[PDB]
């Protein structure tokens, strides 16, 4: 019995510092991973694998997973909590209910009553066995209001059909009928690609057809696809390719359409690009909200002969992962934080290798542009523009949906010639030419050709051509608030003008009166100092609403 110089008024930790790894959760995650690689760039997939198996990511599983992958606790927690679809449950936290119901609250579904539907589905159905939550646009705006029950997306949903899907345990995704490998080959599929590969079709011929056709980035930025392809292949190898299937832009849904109808057309246009730039592996990054598209691509990639390795990856609820550098970061198993330019992805991208990145739709058209030539593509067009373009039209139209139509249509032409005009009892008031990011234009400016370039004069851009039509029954200022709420949630948090700016603007826009001057100074700062295009375009709704709808600000400054 010996004294000691310490204070003697504290007790030592029974265990080492921090939280510990549980032996049962370690055994369970050992069993769950099987022989899958414990490499870092599979972190998001293994988090999908714990969430899909157990319905949640408990901390005891998260800790076993970081230990199995040699990662720090903060690295896995950092990454997991970045993505909206991962439920991390700590000590003292309840478990996630067995069934999850997600109700979209983006602009189009909100126009058809999404907020009230969320409240109604919450009072009537939420319980210990059902969780009811909001979600951003899930690419079903032509079926607004969209609601997800498990992995089953209900179109034009109400309480009756969602109640019927729950009580029927109707929670799996319904796979439609599509053009499969046998049917695709019977229509001459995988012919242009094989001629390109074998040697008869020269690679320089492919690059020439693209430059002549003028195929531009259908993901929204409109960069010339041939110019990009030459740039990637003009870089020292090894090179890689990544397919952007995030389609997270509210109002956009053309990629989901082409995937669920004719997937191998996209797969061949992809494998063509993979051959032009000599990519060892291709990565398809499909957003989590497309489980129908996920099962279709899983089935059809397996039907392909054994060539280029195709890695199908799965998003986890994050609109920022549609930015090329953020998608790359997400593919490497990290938080989706955009990188700083320069360098650009075509030179230092996925795994610091020169990386070719293309949108689902851009690759979809490669096969046809080659077999039919550039002059067939440039034959279509309107008002001085050339080429085809897929417009995702939602809102107050009689016939919403993807409209493959000539580039350069006016919004008046796109609505009367392709969408049956405005809905019954609505008058054309405003439209979003480029989804959330492209700003809000009034109905009186309906004579502006819609294509890359034509809208910048007006502070807008066509972007992904997510066309949303609003009417006099809709609220234009409430439209811009819904878009700011979206960006405030989607902002990856990296930099001040976007992280704080989106939040500050949303807070200001909820006052009865808008302080347009302060929003003006902030908008200027956001597009001038934000790192990436999310913050650079987040204020585009507010700026255009202030400029093009003076009647919506009666009060004096």
């Amino acid at each position: 019995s010996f004294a000691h110089p310490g204070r003697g008024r504290n007790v030592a930790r029974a265990v080492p510092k921090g939280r510990q790894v549980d032996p049962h959760a370690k055994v369970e995650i050992e069993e769950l991973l099987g022989t899958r690689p414990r490499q870092r760039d599979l972190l998001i997939e293994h988090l999908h694998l714990i969430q899909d198996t157990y319905g949640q990511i408990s901390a005891d599983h998260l800790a076993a997973l970081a230990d199995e992958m040699s990662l720090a606790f903060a690295e896995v927690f950092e990454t997991a909590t970045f993505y909206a679809h991962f439920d991390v449950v700590k000590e003292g936290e309840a478990d996630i209910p067995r069934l999850t119901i997600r109700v979209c609250d983006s602009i189009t579904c909100a126009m058809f009553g999404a907020d009230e539907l969320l409240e109604t589905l919450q009072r009537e159905l939420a319980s210990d066995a059902v969780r009811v939550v909001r979600a951003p646009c899930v690419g079903l705006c032509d079926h607004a209001p969209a609601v997800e029950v498990g992995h089953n997306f209900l179109h034009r949903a109400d309480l009756a059909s969602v109640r019927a899907a729950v009580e029927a345990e109707d929670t799996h995704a319904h796979i439609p009928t599509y053009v499969d490998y046998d049917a695709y080959r019977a229509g001459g599929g995988y012919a242009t690609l094989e001629r390109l590969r074998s040697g008869e079709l020269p690679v320089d011929d492919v690059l020439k057809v693209l430059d002549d056709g003028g195929l531009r980035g259908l993901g929204g930025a409109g960069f010339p696809t041939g110019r990009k392809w030459r740039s990637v292949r003009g870089e020292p190898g090894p090179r890689l390719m990544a397919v952007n299937g995030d389609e997270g832009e509210p109002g956009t849904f053309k990629d989901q359409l082409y995937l669920n109808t004719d997937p191998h057309r996209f797969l061949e246009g992809m494998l063509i690009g993979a051959h032009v730039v000599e990519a060892a592996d291709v990565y398809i990054y499909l957003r989590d909200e497309y489980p129908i598209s996920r099962e279709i691509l899983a089935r059809e990639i397996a039907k392909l002969p054994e060539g280029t390795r195709i890695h199908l990856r799965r998003g986890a609820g994050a609109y920022i992962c549609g930015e090329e550098s953020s998608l790359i970061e997400s593919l490497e198993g990290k938080r989706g934080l955009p990188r700083h330019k320069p360098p650009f992805p075509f030179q230092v991208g996925l795994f610091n290798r020169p990386t070719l990145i293309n949108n689902i739709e851009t690759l979809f058209w490669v096969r046809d542009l080659i077999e039919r030539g550039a002059e067939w593509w440039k034959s279509h067009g309107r008002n001085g523009r050339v080429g085809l373009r897929s417009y995702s039209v939602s809102g107050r139209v009689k016939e919403p949906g993807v409209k493959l139509a000539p580039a350069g249509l006016t919004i008046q032409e796109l609505i009367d010639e392709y969408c049956g005009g405005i809905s019954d009892g609505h008058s054309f008031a405003a439209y979003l030419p480029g989804g959330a990011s492209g700003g809000i234009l009034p109905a009186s400016m309906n004579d502006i050709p819609l294509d890359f370039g034509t809208l910048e004069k007006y502070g807008c851009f066509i972007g992904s051509a997510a066309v949303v039509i609003l009417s006099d029954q809709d609220d234009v200022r409430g439209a811009a608030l819904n878009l700011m709420k979206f960006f405030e949630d989607e902002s990856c948090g990296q930099c001040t003008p976007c992280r704080s700016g989106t939040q500050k603007a949303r807070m200001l826009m909820e006052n009865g009166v808008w302080d347009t001057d302060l929003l003006g100074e902030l908008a200027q700062c956001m597009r001038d100092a934000s790192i990436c295009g999310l913050g650079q375009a987040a204020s585009n709704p507010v700026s255009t609403v202030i400029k093009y709808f003076p009647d919506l600000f009666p009060e004096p400054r």
């Binding site: 004294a3 000691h4 310490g6 029974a14 939280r19 700083h340 948090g493 704080s500």
Partner: protein, 911 residues
């Protein structure tokens, strides 16, 4: 040089735009950019934007380097509007400056340059306080999400505690799974709070119960760290003559990096138990092995006395034993925590005043077996490369050392090397380490089988023709002895002895030999065995036959543990050599010093630390002088060691507190602490660094050198030094290693690696590039057989007891248990066992248990640690309530004279 235009003027760079502007006198606001080494810019805060003509959008001047023909404008309305707007965005969430967590933060400074005093944006209600950690307060409502702390924790230190979780404005700094900082893996290194520009992270010492800052120190003093051999340079914050906080300074070894003991364990100098007057044991109070004194109440055993009387009885008792029983009945234990000048005086006092070579210090229980083999093969008593050489190493070997616990700042550079350069780290240690997560391989071999494992790797390199014949031809000897004897130690046969499968042994041997540069670290796991000299020989043999030495990123680095163990040995504080390792038994050496000191010296080498303990039991050693050593806790087999101290006719102890050793003392002399002295100190890299006093000693404590001179005068030695400078001047004339190193040079340069060739050039960090200081210039390889431990487990004692260290505590605990933060972090005696073993004994984690060996028994808590192998008990020796050295086996390595602290047999019974 890149010439470009900046704000209308032609300038030249190299360096980013921000850095050019700072150097031209144009300060550009910056928050997430920390212009200090190791903090690579991130460009997230956007406070530093500039206008680059011809570019659509503004650029962050901290991220962008200039280009030829670049027009950069920082004073444009457009650029200054964006910067002030960024600051206005952040000021909206900041707590009111006057009562904030840091009203004079770097953030508010940048706010004041943009004249952003208020924000017209609404505030967001954010996170609440986190004060669970006793050293640091977390108040994230001042956080700007600049991730300086994240880089601090995950790039500079690579402690890997902090993260930036969630998304958008919910992006939050978190510890592990957003756990409380005080219940997380945080090691309290303080890198994050030193980097934080907002006060969101602050030293707890600075804030009141409302998390408002209250402590603004009067002054700061640059000095060193009193603890370990990394030699970190430190800035000490003094408020009203009290050290209140400490920061990292850009010293050669540490680059502003610290660990918890350097940043927070400074307050032992202010502890109420600090000795302030001399003590003389009461004339009627006898000595006993198990007798305890109360450090707060020594009047039960001691009387207070003047310096004149305490020194008279201190020297008088030693002088009576010398003059009656002879010089042979005295011995001295020096301090490897003191300065080089004090070690030189102490060894001089024992040799000139006691008349013997019975002088030693804690290096006898430390790297004695390592330096024995290094002298035997290289004639060297120091490392061949700095620990910063790990950054140039392709393969890093850490064997028998736990650097993230015991040399943390150095360990941050080995983790940097893995993360930034792709070094392949191989850890060899029975226990798993926190370092193991970054390692390419971790061999968790059986305790006590280094020779078996390392001889397998020499067998792989020698049989597969992986050695460097050019180097073996030019610079080694005795390599043929190794080929003939190494044949029986095959990976297949040695796999069962060390527990490492034979294929991993070959892979490690192939990897080490084929690397372009390989660097070996080792510590007490290698040296503290009855075969520790053999463990070292195998390591040297690995470096000699592969030529992995003498080049950048290569060599042999036995991690020197004490803050001046290397310097105290340089100054001759060991029984067999004068300063600079000159044999006392070489008549030519003895005659040199006899003329330089003016008296005949003993030609026979003295005894070692444990050999003096035994001589005391034989009644041969009767008086001792102990300064800055606590053998009543640090010596093995304490029941016997404390009994030896109880039998001394006369024990003088010079220390800061009434330690377990001073219990048995006849005279206690209150001494100055590190932060109160000036002098030189030699780190593990041979960097000689000068220290200067931060505060004055309390009461009547005196300078160590002064007390040594006062005892020396009373032993007929006419010394009259003025201080450390005058002593350093005398050492330089007998220490060639100090050539071109002068006190003036260290005062202006701070640190100088030795040996130096010129008073202006830097020192030779890497040595042995062109041969060794042996006779032939070559290094002798010395084969090694498998020696068993002195004590091995049987049925009565089925467990292997190993002893060692924890991050927050130092050796015997006499200093760190008196530092408030370190004592709150590790307040109670614990030993570590595997969970499976706790199950078999029916113990729960935190339960009490009895730990017994043939030599002693203790009762303490058990901490459950899966990184501890089955059949092993690991126990720090820092807890007087359950002193590990009551259990340890005092068996000595015959060549090094070091005990086997790392291996004995023990048994556990629940208590």
């Amino acid at each position: 040089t890149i010439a470009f235009e900046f704000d209308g003027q032609q300038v030249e760079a190299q360096e980013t735009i921000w850095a050019v502007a700072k150097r031209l006198g144009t300060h550009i606001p910056h928050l997430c950019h920390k212009p200090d080494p190791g903090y690579r810019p991130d460009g997230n805060c956007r406070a530093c934007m500039v206008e680059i003509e011809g570019e659509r959008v503004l650029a962050a001047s901290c991220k962008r380097t200039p280009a030829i023909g670049m027009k950069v404008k920082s004073a444009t309305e457009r650029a200054t509007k964006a910067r002030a707007m960024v600051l206005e965005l952040l000021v909206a969430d900041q707590p009111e400056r006057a009562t904030s967590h840091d009203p004079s933060s770097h953030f508010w400074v940048q706010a004041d340059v943009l004249d952003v005093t208020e924000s017209r944006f609404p505030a967001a209600e954010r996170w609440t306080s986190d004060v669970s950690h006793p050293a640091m307060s977390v108040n994230l409502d001042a956080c700007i999400q600049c991730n300086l702390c994240v880089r601090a924790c995950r790039e500079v230190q690579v402690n890997d505690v902090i993260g930036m979780a969630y998304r958008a404005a919910g992006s939050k700094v978190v510890f592990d799974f957003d756990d409380p900082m005080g219940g997380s893996t945080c090691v309290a290194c303080g890198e994050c709070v030193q980097a934080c520009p907002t006060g969101a992270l602050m030293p707890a010492a600075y804030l009141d119960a409302n998390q408002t800052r209250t402590v603004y120190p009067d002054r700061e003093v640059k000095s060193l760290c009193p603890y370990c051999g990394v030699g970190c340079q430190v800035s000490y914050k003094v408020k009203d003559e009290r050290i209140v906080y400490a920061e990292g300074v850009n010293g050669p070894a540490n680059q502003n990096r610290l660990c918890v003991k350097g940043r927070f364990g400074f307050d032992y100098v202010h502890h109420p138990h600090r000795l302030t007057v001399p003590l003389i044991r009461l004339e009627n109070v006898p000595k006993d092995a198990n007798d305890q004194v109360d450090p707060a109440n020594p009047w039960t055993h001691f009387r207070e006395a003047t310096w004149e009387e305490a020194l008279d009885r201190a020297a008088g008792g030693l002088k009576a034993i010398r003059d009656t029983n002879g010089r042979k009945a005295l011995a001295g234990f020096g301090s490897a925590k003191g300065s080089n000048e004090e070690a030189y005086l102490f060894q001089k006092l024992v040799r000139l005043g006691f008349g013997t070579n019975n002088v030693d210090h804690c290096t006898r229980l430390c790297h004695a077996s390592s330096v024995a083999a290094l002298m035997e093969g290289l004639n060297s008593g120091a490392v061949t490369a700095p620990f910063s050489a790990a950054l140039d190493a392709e393969v890093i070997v850490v064997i028998g050392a736990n650097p993230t616990v015991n040399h943390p700042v150095a360990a941050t550079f080995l983790k940097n090397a893995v993360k930034q350069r792709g070094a392949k780290l191989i850890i060899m240690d029975p226990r798993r380490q926190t370092l193991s997560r970054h390692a390419y391989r971790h061999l968790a071999f059986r305790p006590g089988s280094d020779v078996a494992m390392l001889n397998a790797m020499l067998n792989v390199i020698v049989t597969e023709g992986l050695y460097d014949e050019q180097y073996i031809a030019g610079y080694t000897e005795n390599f043929e002895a190794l080929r003939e004897k190494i044949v029986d130690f095959t990976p297949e046969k040695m796999a069962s002895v060390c527990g490492i499968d034979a294929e991993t042994l070959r892979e490690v041997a192939r990897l080490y030999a084929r690397a372009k540069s390989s660097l070996i670290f080792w510590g007490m796991g290698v040296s503290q065995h009855v075969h520790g000299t053999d463990n070292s020989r195998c390591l040297i043999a690995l470096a000699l036959i592969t030529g992995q030495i003498g080049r950048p990123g290569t060599g042999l680095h036995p991690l020197r543990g004490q803050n001046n163990v290397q310097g105290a040995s340089d100054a001759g504080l060991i029984p067999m050599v004068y300063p600079d390792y000159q044999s006392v038994e070489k008549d030519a050496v003895r005659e040199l010093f006899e003329e330089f000191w003016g008296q005949s010296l003993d030609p026979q080498k003295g005894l070692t630390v444990v050999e003096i303990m035994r001589a005391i039991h034989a009644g041969e050693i009767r008086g001792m002088f102990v300064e800055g050593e606590n053998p009543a806790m640090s010596d093995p087999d304490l029941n016997h060691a404390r009994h030896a101290l109880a039998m001394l006719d006369h024990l003088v102890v010079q220390d800061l507190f009434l330690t377990e050793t001073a219990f048995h003392a006849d005279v206690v002399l209150p001494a100055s602490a590190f932060a109160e002295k000036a002098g030189t100190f030699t780190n593990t890299d041979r960097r000689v660094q000068i220290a200067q006093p931060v505060v004055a000693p309390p009461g009547d404590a005196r300078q160590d050198w002064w007390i040594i001179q006062e005892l020396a005068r009373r032993l007929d030695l006419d010394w009259n030094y003025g201080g450390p400078a005058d002593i350093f001047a005398e050492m330089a004339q007998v220490m060639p290693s100090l050539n071109n190193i002068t006190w003036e040079r260290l005062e202006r340069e701070g640190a100088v690696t030795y040996p130096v060739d010129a008073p202006d050039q830097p020192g030779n960090e890497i040595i042995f590039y062109a041969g060794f200081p042996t006779e032939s210039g070559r290094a002798k390889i010395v084969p090694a057989a498998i020696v068993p431990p002195d004590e091995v487990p049987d049925d009565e004692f089925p467990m292997v007891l190993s002893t060692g260290r924890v991050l927050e505590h130092w050796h015997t605990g006499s200093m760190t248990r008196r530092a408030g933060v370190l004592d709150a972090l590790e307040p109670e005696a614990v030993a570590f066992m595997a969970p499976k073993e706790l199950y078999r004994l029916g113990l729960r984690p935190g339960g009490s248990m009895r730990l017994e060996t043939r030599r002693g028994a203790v009762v303490l808590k058990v901490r459950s640690d899966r990184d501890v192998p089955i059949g092993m008990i690991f126990m720090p020796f820092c807890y007087a309530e359950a002193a590990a050295n009551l259990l340890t086996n005092p068996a000595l390595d015959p060549l090094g004279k070091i005990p086997e602290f790392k291996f004995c047999a023990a048994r556990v019974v629940p208590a």
